[PDB]
Design a protein around this ligand. Sequence first.
Ligand SMILES: [Zn+2]
Length: 171
Amino acid sequence: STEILVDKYSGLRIKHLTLSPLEISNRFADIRFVRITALKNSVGSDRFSGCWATAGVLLDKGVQRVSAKGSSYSIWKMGALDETDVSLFLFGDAHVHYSGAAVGSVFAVFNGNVRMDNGGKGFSMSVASVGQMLKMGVASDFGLCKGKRKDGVACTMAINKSKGSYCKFHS
DNA sequence: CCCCCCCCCCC
Ligand SMILES: [Zn+2]
């Protein structure tokens, strides 16, 4: 049957759990957790100094990229399915080992290096190591917009199916 | 060699 966790950490609802609730508290035990939506308002307040972690839904896997050094990497759109997103850069092993992940997945991110751009591009974080990514499961509220683009292509914006079936762009 | 690696959709 359906098995849904209503997580206090991420503030998300997760199905297809890859771990027990006890295992969650263990991973987050000695770590300062910051909600993925609080991130942009948390820059420059010593929130990311020590060991920290966040968690969000994979909204967009973007396109294949190549580093200046010639290595491949990823740029993910992550969020809590609430009109607010954030950029995640997957480098090296992290990209190798998680670039095939499915949109809708719920990932815990550990100790990402933070970049904040007050020029409009906003909050972003990056990780490069395998243990910096933990798939907790699948967002039970995740869905794709049922609306269509201007050119007739099905919209691929992530939505909260519990609160509606369309983007900010479709109403 | 390792670490490093860094953004123009959907209105
Ligand atoms: Zn749409």
